[PDB]
Amino acid sequence: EGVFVSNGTHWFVTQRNFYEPQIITTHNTFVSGNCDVVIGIVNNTVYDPLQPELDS
């Protein structure tokens, strides 16, 4: 839920009706298939909070 947003250096996800920028994560997002199908898709990291929990 919400929308992806940037101001020219970072990508964040916000709810639609009030600016509330969050880090883009596997909790904030769902997958569907490969890059090649979507028009206007962009390259950015998606964070996974499990990986530091496995590292710690």
Binding site: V3, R16, F30, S32, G33, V37, V38, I39, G40
Partner: protein, 50 residues
């Protein structure tokens, strides 16, 4: 508040309980079905007054 039309349509899909990726994956089919469906209005109203 401006928004790209393909993203407005993904929200209008997400409003009827169809997941956003169904639009972005089928965007060419949806655009062609829409453009064709408006052509039938133009031809219907051109063809008869009734």
């Amino acid at each position: 508040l401006q928004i790209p039309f393909a993203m407005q349509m993904a929200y209008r899909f997400n409003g009827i309980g169809v997941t956003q990726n169904v639009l972005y994956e089928n965007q060419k089919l949806i655009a062609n079905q829409f453009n064709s469906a408006i052509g039938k209005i133009q031809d219907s109203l051109s063809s008869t007054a009734s």
